[PDB]
UniProtKB/Swiss-Prot annotation, chain A:
It comes from the Eukaryota. This is Tubulin alpha-1B chain. The modification Phosphoserine is found at S138. The gene is TUBA1B. The record marks Y150 as: Involved in polymerization. It comes from Sus scrofa.
Swiss-Prot record, chain B:
This is Microtubule-associated protein tau. It comes from Homo sapiens. The chain holds residues 568 to 615 of 758 of the full protein. It is found in: Cytoplasm, Cytosol; Cell membrane; Cytoplasm, Cytoskeleton; Cell projection, Axon. Changing N29K: In FTD1; with parkinsonism. Changing L16V: In FTD1; less able to promote microtubule assembly than wild-type tau. Coiled coil: none annotated. The modification Deamidated asparagine is found at N29. The tau/MAP repeat binds to tubulin. Type I isoforms contain 3 repeats while type II isoforms contain 4 repeats. The gene is MAPT. Phosphorylation at serine and threonine residues in S-P or T-P motifs by proline-directed protein kinases (PDPK1, CDK1, CDK5, GSK3, MAPK) (only 2-3 sites per protein in interphase, seven-fold increase in mitosis, and in the form associated with paired helical filaments (PHF-tau)), and at serine residues in K-X-G-S motifs by MAP/microtubule affinity-regulating kinase (MARK1, MARK2, MARK3 or MARK4), causing detachment from microtubules, and their disassembly. Phosphorylation decreases with age. Polyubiquitinated. Requires functional TRAF6 and may provoke SQSTM1-dependent degradation by the proteasome. PHF-tau can be modified by three different forms of polyubiquitination. 'Lys-48'-linked polyubiquitination is the major form, 'Lys-6'-linked and 'Lys-11'-linked polyubiquitination also occur. There is a cross-link at K4, K9, K17, K31, K48 (Glycyl lysine isopeptide (Lys-Gly) (interchain with G-Cter in ubiquitin)). Promotes microtubule assembly and stability, and might be involved in the establishment and maintenance of neuronal polarity. The C-terminus binds axonal microtubules while the N-terminus binds neural plasma membrane components, suggesting that tau functions as a linker protein between both. Axonal polarity is predetermined by TAU/MAPT localization (in the neuronal cell) in the domain of the cell body defined by the centrosome. The short isoforms allow plasticity of the cytoskeleton whereas the longer isoforms may preferentially play a role in its stabilization.
Length: 150, 48
């Protein structure tokens, strides 16, 4: 529900919330199945990468809706470098308006500083590099593509 | 528009020397002394 490719990012933390007719062993098996499909790479500095919650009440759809009804359902909150890479875009659209100082008088006109925009850009650029440092998880490798001679 | 290659804030900078290493244990014990021994259930004088 955010326009970023998770396969391009790296997973960092997940909370999974379960509703309705749900079995703890089947939740365990579902999450174990994700951890064995390690192509869904989580950070190597946090192997214990899941939180779980389970509640007995199934979801209700408000009449006039379109969502199918279900005996059980799943909600997730996920932290991943992909959504900071979406922020790195929103910052390079700020940068383009500020590189021509477009619109800044509608905000300096309220008794802000132009100095505030320059502060804000730099704070954001520091955040993108904060996320770059934790994208760099110093995970170990697997193999080479070629063999050797003797 | 050149930002001057802005640096991150604020990272795992306190971990850059960290591993950490392990301590040691060695147990290992001393022998008790059982050298205070003599039997009584025989004869040392009336044998003569």
């Amino acid at each position: 529900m955010v326009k970023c490719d998770p396969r391009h990012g790296k997973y960092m933390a997940c909370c999974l919330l379960y509703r309705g007719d749900v079995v703890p062993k089947d939740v365990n098996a579902a999450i174990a199945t994700i951890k064995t499909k390690r192509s869904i790479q989580f950070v190597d500095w946090c192997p214990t990468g899941f939180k779980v919650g389970i509640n007995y009440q199934p979801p209700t759809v408000v009449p006039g809706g379109d969502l199918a009804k279900v005996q059980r359902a799943v909600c997730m909150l996920s932290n991943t470098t992909a959504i900071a890479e979406a922020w790195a875009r929103l910052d390079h659209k700020f940068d383009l308006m500020y590189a021509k100082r477009a619109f800044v008088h509608w905000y300096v006109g309220e008794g802000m500083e132009e100095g505030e925009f320059s502060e804000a850009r730099e704070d954001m650029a520091a955040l993108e590099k904060d996320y770059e440092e934790v994208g760099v998880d110093s995970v170990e490798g697997e193999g080479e593509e070629e063999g050797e001679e003797y | 528009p050149d930002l001057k290659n802005v640096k991150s804030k604020i990272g795992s900078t306190e971990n850059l020397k960290h591993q950490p290493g392990g301590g040691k244990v060695q147990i290992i014990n001393k022998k008790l002394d059982l050298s205070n021994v003599q039997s009584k259930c025989g004869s040392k004088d009336n044998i003569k």
